[PDB]
């Protein structure tokens, strides 16, 4: 198990992609997995050990290209709409 990187996970037939972190949310004795809203599996307890995992969806957003008129110049800048700057280098 790895935690602080976006990963594919399969927990007892529950498949999804996201970043896994230690959950602040507290489960009742044998609830299996939470779904915060709209049946999205936002969390799961591990089957092998018994830790609780909080799941945040894979970071994503829209990319837009800032440019002056190509008539005037060719330099161009790019803006990533919804990401912290430290985690853009991946894509």
């Amino acid at each position: 198990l790895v935690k602080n990187k976006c990963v594919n996970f399969n927990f007892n037939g529950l498949t999804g992609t996201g970043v896994l972190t230690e959950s602040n949310k507290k489960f009742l004795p044998f609830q299996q997995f939470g779904r915060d809203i709209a049946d999205t599996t936002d969390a799961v307890r591990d089957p092998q050990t018994l830790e609780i995992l909080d799941i945040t969806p894979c970071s994503f957003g829209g990319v837009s290209v800032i440019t002056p008129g190509t008539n005037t110049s060719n330099q161009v800048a790019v803006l990533y709409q919804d990401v912290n700057c430290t985690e853009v280098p991946v894509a």
Binding site: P57, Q81, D82
Partner: peptide, 25 residues
């Protein structure tokens, strides 16, 4: 501002910021 009360994080959905922030309006 303090009277009026006012999207949750999800896939696909995204909310752009308004062009003029409240501080400049």
């Amino acid at each position: 501002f303090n009277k009026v009360t006012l999207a949750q994080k999800f896939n696909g959905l995204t909310v752009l910021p308004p062009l003029l922030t409240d501080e400049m309006i």
